[PDB]
């Protein structure tokens, strides 16, 4: 049969995306070597994986209560949230009270740091206006999801933008300062910026009240990263040898020194070469929702060239960079051969899809998505296995808090991810939980502990 012949040929093109268990162990071990290097004074500057100290400590610590503004920059949108923090019969609960999401126009994104933060300030103002509380002066917590060198919980230098951010005059500067300045320049409201955390960190924190075993935070959204509670004595960059501190791996930059060269496909190199940060964030580029749809687009385009898809004719849309969105990937079924959604997606893209085109698009989506899950699983496994060694436990029971557009909305991803992590982590009992408003709530909780002065 003809449609079978096309699918066999497709499958041989997509086999390239496979990763054997030994490929994943190789990646996992390489990741562990970079983590080791990032944690040590002598190799920290040259590590691809930076392992940044967050100054979020395991020490039970005094907390204020009340209302906090949480800002969240670094996902799809910028989010502003009122969060209530209070004491419970056990620990400290947090509850989202109000929330608004804002898109950020491309210009405010690739202009100056000042434009970007001015834009941020307008949105905050708009949200204060909506709830008539421009008069109040709140403690603000800032989830800012990019590589930051912290000197403390409320002072951090941006190391570099990732995920397509390009605002000039931001790198090397104090991010909290940029925000305070922008709010200052505006006038119509006041805020005490008291904390700044990575999204991985906020997410971990948000999950503590419900499960004291949560010591890993993971994000698979636009970007991909993880934080974990490291033995204070292994944190060579911070004085102290008791208890634990949250380390922000910034594992997205894994591969930035060649570590992944043998696994990169032409689609990967194409995506990297055309990105805002070529040569950087190579691991993230295999996984992140910012890149996943675009990888799929390049695969489809290859299949068209081989005359296996769309009768070798691609609409101008499909030939447009970024036209295949990541959400389309998540709107693609798996265990059921449903073609409805794919047919609609592809029609809107200006294509006349056959039943067979749909099935092939679904396989392309599965292939890219599945390799993302597998690659991601080697990183988390590397982390968790290392914690097991570092805590010298025969069996380690650990809870991982997860957030992000991709883990939450891609059902096939979640399942492939869990199974792969688990095969790679013998003698660890891993519980996964999806945080709810993890970024907003996590940030308020940190702000609460910071306000207590
Ligand atoms: O949003 C998930 C991740 O995306 C990018 O990797 C950012 O550099 C990192 O800080 C963030 O945690």
All structural domains of the chain, each given as residue ranges with its CATH number in brackets, are 1-53+210-436 (3.40.367.20), 54-209+437-449 (3.30.420.40)
Under 8 Å CB-to-CB from 378, ≥6 apart: which residues?
A: 24, 25, 27, 28, 31, 420, 424
* Helix axes of 355-390 and 21-39: crossing angle, nearest 10 degrees: 50
* DSSP three-state, residue 169: coil
Q: What angle do CA 21, 27, 30 make, to 5 degrees?
A: 140
Residues, the chain? 453
Selection from 375, 377, 376, 370 nearest residue 15 by Cα: 370
Helix H or strand E segment including 59:
none
Please give the DSSP secondary-structure letter assigned to residue 112: B
Phi, psi of 324, rounded to the nearest 5 degrees: -90, 100
Q: Is 324 exposed, middle or buried (0-12, 13-18, 19+ CB in 10 A)?
A: buried
Under 8 Å CB-to-CB from 215, ≥6 apart: which residues?
A: 204, 228, 229, 244, 387, 398, 399
Helix H or strand E segment including 381:
helix 355-390
Cβ 403 under 6 angstroms from ligand 1: no
Q: How far away, in angstroms, is 169 Cα from ligand 1 center?
A: 20
Consult the annotation and say whether 330 binds a ligand.
yes
Q: Point out the ligand 1 atom lying closest to the alpha carbon of residue 146.
A: 10
Q: Point out the ligand 1 atom lying closest to the alpha carbon of residue 75.
A: 1
Distance from C-alpha of 153 to C-alpha of 59, rounded to nearest angstrom: 14
Distance from C-alpha of 359 to C-alpha of 338, rounded to nearest angstrom: 9
Q: How far away, in angstroms, is 162 Cα from ligand 1 center?
A: 7
**In contact, 72 and 120? CB cutoff 8 Å:** no
Distance from C-alpha of 369 to C-alpha of 293, rounded to nearest angstrom: 9
Residue 273, by phi and psi: left (phi above 0), alpha (psi -120 to 50) or beta? alpha
* Residue numbers annotated as active site: 163, 199
Phi, psi of 39, rounded to the nearest 5 degrees: -80, -10
Distance from C-alpha of 159 to C-alpha of 171, rounded to nearest angstrom: 6
Q: List the alpha helices (DSSP H) in 43-112.
A: 107-110
Q: How far away, in angstroms, is 284 Cα from ligand 1 center?
A: 9
Please give the DSSP secondary-structure letter assigned to residue 174: B
Selection from 144, 123, 142 nearest residue 74 by Cα: 144
Residue position matching structure tokens 């380690």: 396
**In contact, 342 and 358? CB cutoff 8 Å:** yes
Distance from C-alpha of 383 to C-alpha of 31, rounded to nearest angstrom: 8
Phi, psi of 146, rounded to the nearest 5 degrees: -145, 165
Token pair of 407, please?
Answer: 């883990």
Across 106-139, b (16+ Cβ under 10 Å) vs e yields eebbbbebbbbbbbbbebbbebbeeeebeeeebb
Cβ 54 under 6 angstroms from ligand 1: no
**In contact, 230 and 240? CB cutoff 8 Å:** no
Token pair of 122, please?
Answer: 């307008």
Selection from 209, 134, 214, 253 nearest residue 401 by Cα: 214
| Most ligand 1 atoms within 8 A of CB, residue of 250, 288, 380, 443 to mutate | 250
Q: DSSP string spanning 418-440? A: HHHHHHH-TTEEEEEEE-SSHHH
Q: How far away, in angstroms, is 345 Cα from ligand 1 center?
A: 28
Cβ 146 under 6 angstroms from ligand 1: yes
Distance of CA 88 to the CA centre of its chain: 30
Q: Is the dihedral of CA 150, 151, 154, 160 positive or negative?
A: negative
**In contact, 163 and 223? CB cutoff 8 Å:** yes
Cβ 204 under 6 angstroms from ligand 1: no
Cβ 163 under 6 angstroms from ligand 1: yes
Residue position matching structure tokens 């599945």: 370
Consult the annotation and say whether 162 binds a ligand.
yes
Q: How far away, in angstroms, is 186 Cα from ligand 1 center?
A: 29
**In contact, 159 and 149? CB cutoff 8 Å:** yes
Q: Point out the ligand 1 atom lying closest to the alpha carbon of residue 163.
A: 5
Neighbours of 191 (CB within 10 A): 19
Nearest CA to ligand 1 atom 11: 145
Consult the annotation and say whether 236 binds a ligand.
no
Cβ 221 under 6 angstroms from ligand 1: yes
Residues pairing with 139 in the sheet:
192
Q: Is the dihedral of CA 339, 340, 343, 346 positive or negative?
A: negative
Query: Max Cα separation, the chain?
Result: 75
Between strands 190-197 and 52-57, the pairing is unpaired
Cβ 199 under 6 angstroms from ligand 1: yes
């Amino acid at each position: 049969y003809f449609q079978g012949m096309k699918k066999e040929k497709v499958e041989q093109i997509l086999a390239e995306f496979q990763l054997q268990e030994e490929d994943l162990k190789k990646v996992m071990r390489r990741m562990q070597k970079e983590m080791d290097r990032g944690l040590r004074l002598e190799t920290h500057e040259e590590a691809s994986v930076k392992m940044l100290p967050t100054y979020v400590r395991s020490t039970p610590e005094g907390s204020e209560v009340g209302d906090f503004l949480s800002l969240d920059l670094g996902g799809t949108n910028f989010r502003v949230m009122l969060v209530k923090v209070g004491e419970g019969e056990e620990g400290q609960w947090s509850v989202k009270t109000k929330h608004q999401m804002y898109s950020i126009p491309e210009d405010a994104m690739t202009g100056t740091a000042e434009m970007l933060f001015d834009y941020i300030s307008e949105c905050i103002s708009d949200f204060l206006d909506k709830h008539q509380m421009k008069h109040k002066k709140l403690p603000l917590g800032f989830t800012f999801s990019f590589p930051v060198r912290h000197e403390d919980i409320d002072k951090g230098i941006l190391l570099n933008w990732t995920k397509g951010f390009k605002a000039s005059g931001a790198e090397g500067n104090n991010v909290v300062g940029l925000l305070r300045d922008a709010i200052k320049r505006r006038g119509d409201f006041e805020m005490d910026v008291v904390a700044m955390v990575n999204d991985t960190v906020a997410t971990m924190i948000s999950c503590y009240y419900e499960d004291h075993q949560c010591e890993v935070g993971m994000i698979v959204g636009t970007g991909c990263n993880a934080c974990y509670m490291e033995e204070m004595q292994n944190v060579e960059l911070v004085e102290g040898d008791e208890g634990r501190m949250c380390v922000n791996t910034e594992w997205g930059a894994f591969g930035d020194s060649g570590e992944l060269d043998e696994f990169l496909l032409e689609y990967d190199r194409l995506v990297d070469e055309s990105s805002a940060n070529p040569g950087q964030q190579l691991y993230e580029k295999l996984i992140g929702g910012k890149y996943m749809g675009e990888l799929v687009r390049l695969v489809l385009l290859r299949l068209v060239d081989e005359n296996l898809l769309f009768h070798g004719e691609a609409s101008e849309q499909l030939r447009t960079r970024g036209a295949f969105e990541t959400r389309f990937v998540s709107q693609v079924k798996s265990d059921t051969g449903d073609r409805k959604q794919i047919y609609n997606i592809l029609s809107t893209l200006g294509l006349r899809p056959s039943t067979t085109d749909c099935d092939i698009v679904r396989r392309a989506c599965e292939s890219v998505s599945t390799r993302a899950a597998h690659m991601c699983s080697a990183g988390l496994a590397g982390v968790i296995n290392r914690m097991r060694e570092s805590r010298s436990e025969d069996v380690m029971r650990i809870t991982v808090g997860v957030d992000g557009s991709v883990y939450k909305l891609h059902p096939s991803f979640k399942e492939r991810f869990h199974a792969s992590v688990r095969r790679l982590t013998p003698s660890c009992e891993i519980t996964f939980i999806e945080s709810e408003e993890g970024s907003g709530r996590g940030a308020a909780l940190v702000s609460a502990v910071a306000c207590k002065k």
